[PDB]
Design an enzyme around this catalytic site. Sequence first.
Site: not given
Ligand SMILES: Cc1nc2ccc(C(=O)NCc3ccccc3)cc2n2c(-c3ccccc3)nnc12
Ligand SMILES: [Mg+2]
Ligand SMILES: [Zn+2]
Length: 340
Positions: A78, A119, A230
């Site tokens: 981030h 972010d 995003d």
């Molecule tokens: C590759 C990848 N894996 C993630 C896995 C897991 C997660 C992740 O935060 N998952 C848990 C979750 C899911 C749905 C709602 C609330 C919480 C995020 C991932 N991600 C992001 C991202 C992270 C935070 C906020 C926004 C986007 N961007 N890329 C990813």
């Molecule tokens: Mg964010």
């Molecule tokens: Zn982001």
Amino acid sequence: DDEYTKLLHDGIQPVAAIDSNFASFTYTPRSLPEDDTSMAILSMLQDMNFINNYKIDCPTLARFCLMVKKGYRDPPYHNWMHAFSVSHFCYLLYKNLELTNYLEDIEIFALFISCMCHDLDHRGTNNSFQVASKSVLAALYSSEGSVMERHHFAQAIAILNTHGCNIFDHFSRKDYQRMLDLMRDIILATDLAHHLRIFKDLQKMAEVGYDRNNKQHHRLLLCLLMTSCDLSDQTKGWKTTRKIAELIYKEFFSQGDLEKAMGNRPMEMMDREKAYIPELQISFMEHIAMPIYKLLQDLFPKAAELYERVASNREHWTKVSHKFTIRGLPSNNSLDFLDE
Ligand SMILES: Cc1nc2ccc(C(=O)NCc3ccccc3)cc2n2c(-c3ccccc3)nnc12
Ligand SMILES: [Mg+2]
Ligand SMILES: [Zn+2]
């Protein structure tokens, strides 16, 4: 001042001069060196004609762009390059998908600026950690949720309210308020929790068909495109997905380490001892990333290639999942790793 001096007075380069493929989905903006990214932000703004159309002051814009960049810390994932590559994908949707048939000019301007700021001041930790660690941000914002995202918004406003940084200074009261309203909406949608609540409504919108006269459909579309930006790392080559998994899970595992120093059990995916990265990557892709670009495809037929690449990158993970099981000896020719 020297970076500001050169960014202000040297002039704005054309988007082609950055890269020949700059306006194509196949191009990977992470391959651009960080010290060039502020120029590329200006060139995209120039090329989308936001600088001229909104008569943005160039001295003001230079400062703002650098202030947004220097408003990112440096956790594995981030950081500024995520914001930059997310903003780039916003540029790609403008060039390749004709957003002007769906959205007002000002809404498109808001999305791009939101992408730059969404972010700001992130600390490699999610919302749950803010409450658990009882950080300053939770103290401020925990009672309405989306802790980090609200902080992200607040920080962007702080940048605007810093002297000589308000790129919207000359807007009418009604345009200023609309722009900040948009920024609130758009940035808060970056919480995947929000996305999961509006998901049914997004499906509804795709089924019936987009209606440019419907104010809810604009709000819903703006959320979908923000999430699309995003998660845009997933729409590139396999290699990019590989690297981005490595960066986010580093970030995530670091949090887990802190959680269990504070005596808590981290969620499987934060736990370096428990997290099986192949199943988690495929699961994120299947339940979250893939249906978003399916919906993007449903609204924009020219966005089919994006869903297709995410779907293929998911297939690529399943095929490489077997490399996480150790066959024979591990090239050390040692089994010292088992003494525990
Ligand atoms: C590759 C990848 N894996 C993630 C896995 C897991 C997660 C992740 O935060 N998952 C848990 C979750 C899911 C749905 C709602 C609330 C919480 C995020 C991932 N991600 C992001 C991202 C992270 C935070 C906020 C926004 C986007 N961007 N890329 C990813
Ligand atoms: Mg964010
Ligand atoms: Zn982001």
